[PDB]
Design a protein around this ligand. Structure first.
Ligand SMILES: CCCCCCOc1cccc(CCCNC(=O)/C=C(\O)C(=O)O)c1
Lengths: 205, 211
């Protein structure tokens, strides 16, 4: 069974252009597709769902709602430049939902897979400097403990919408053994049948 | 070159399944697969590719160097093995080193062979090297960025990987290159590796140019 799905949500801009409408309009139907995919994952017993915007201030309004649905919210990515009022909103949102036991929802914000690895490297380098760790002691498992989502089920399936066939520096370390699923369907149109189409692909491998 | 493609990497899968369909033992898939390796190398060499990296998917079948090294050298191909070679048995280590040494001055295709290679291990050995420089106080932790780690992973001095091909129908990287394929085109085909020919390769190059 599929435990942890990651989705690259591409196609909002193309979609808007197809409908002879501006970017703004695509983002908003995109947000609608986010809620449906979240709901579909929670109702189908997926443990973790990780979303990458490829094509945050709008998460204030959705948090109370996620909490009641027993959803644990996390933001992965570099939030250190972000102004400190938003940093503390993200912190409160995380804190509010952290004891929740349903779907863990990871939102990648200013995330890059290379950045993710490097930040973990930096941490082991600090340890080496301090005298706490020898070079030859560093192995896969220890680096794993310092990259994003090490406490979750490993990523089983990566879905990319919108037609491109690339990871584009989303998760790198984490997807060594994931099924990759590429669809031409643009993010605002990706619905429950597309999502199940992708879980199918994973079951057939 | 018109196709835009400097560095192709291939996951060469479907050899086992190819033999089974024929009603043949695995050994015949390995032979058929080895022929298709030679065909993909020649084709890469004649269509202007700078770099071709192969993931072959006891081990002493790997003494397939001595079958091919003279031939590669005669096609002007520069050979390099990537992966953890340290646990290999002394004479195998020397046949690799000599094979590499023999072809290092060649100016055609650079051909990389993954042997006991994994994408995670690759990243991990680059981090070791960096951790050494930290400890032998050359390096500040806060100086480590992407470009730096990038110079310590395999093949850092080659053109970045533009295109990954996997034959055999599965849609996964299986711990082949990870760091290096952040921005690569991924192309999956159901064609089994022994059947993958010039036209299929041409097929992949054109779709890359079109995308
Ligand atoms: C040029 C220097 C030598 C290159 C190193 C390897 O040399 C090879 C020799 C013969 C055949 C191949 C083709 C791939 C082996 N088959 C699989 O991995 C098949 C599966 O994983 C599967 O069938 O599921 C490669």
């Amino acid at each position: 069974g599929c435990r942890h799905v990651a989705i690259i949500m591409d196609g909002n801009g193309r979609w808007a252009k197809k409908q002879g409408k501006i970017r703004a309009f695509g983002h908003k139907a995109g947000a609608k597709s986010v809620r449906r995919a979240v709901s579909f994952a929670a109702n189908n017993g997926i443990e973790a769902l990780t979303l990458y915007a490829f094509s945050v201030w709008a998460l204030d309004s959705e948090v109370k709602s996620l909490h009641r649905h027993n959803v644990r919210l996390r933001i992965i990515g570099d939030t250190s430049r972000f102004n400190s009022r938003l940093q503390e909103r993200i912190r409160k949102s995380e804190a509010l939902t952290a004891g929740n036991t349903g779907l863990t929802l990871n939102i990648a914000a200013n995330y890059g897979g290379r950045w993710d690895i490097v930040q973990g490297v930096r941490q082991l380098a600090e340890k080496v400097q301090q005298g706490n760790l020898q070079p030859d002691q560093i192995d896969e498992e220890m680096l794993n403990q310092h990259v994003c989502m090490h406490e979750l089920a490993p990523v089983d399936l990566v879905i990319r919408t919108g037609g491109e066939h690339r990871i584009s520096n989303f998760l790198l370390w984490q997807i060594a053994y994931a099924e990759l699923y590429f669809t031409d369907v643009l993010w605002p149109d990706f619905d429950e049948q597309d999502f199940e189409g992708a879980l199918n692909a994973f079951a057939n491998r």
